[PDB]
Design a protein around this ligand. Structure first.
Ligand SMILES: [Mg+2]
Lengths: 71, 72
């Protein structure tokens, strides 16, 4: 069972929820952090600046569990 | 609580197991697939080829749950 998928390819950040509850997504790039919400069975798409596509961090919080992906 | 942490930096892949059970890690880059077992509370460190540091996939299997992280 694929629960969480995170893909970063040329600026585009693709965080995907495969759980039964919504998850919070925090994207840290360029020294700033933004929070997003992706519902169950839904895929989130965020774009990165050209000067931050290779120095980003994606943090997904589902329930009380945290998953972090740093580039 | 941090369950899984994946870091890719200039070819160095780091996977930390924050769970209570061992997890299976599959690293695919440039058509080559390597698999590892990471014990709870431990961090796995792998090195990538210079031609595949910007194109890699890290797949973590913790029991029945699968987690995929993709660069590129
Ligand atoms: Mg194995």
């Amino acid at each position: 069972h694929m629960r969480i998928e995170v893909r970063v390819d040329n600026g585009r950040v693709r965080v995907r929820n495969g759980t039964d509850r919504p998850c919070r997504v925090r994207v840290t790039a360029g020294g700033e952090t933004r929070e997003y919400t992706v519902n169950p069975g839904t895929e989130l798409e965020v774009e990165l600046s050209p000067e931050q596509q290779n120095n980003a961090e994606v943090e997904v919080e589902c329930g009380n569990e945290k998953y972090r992906f740093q580039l």
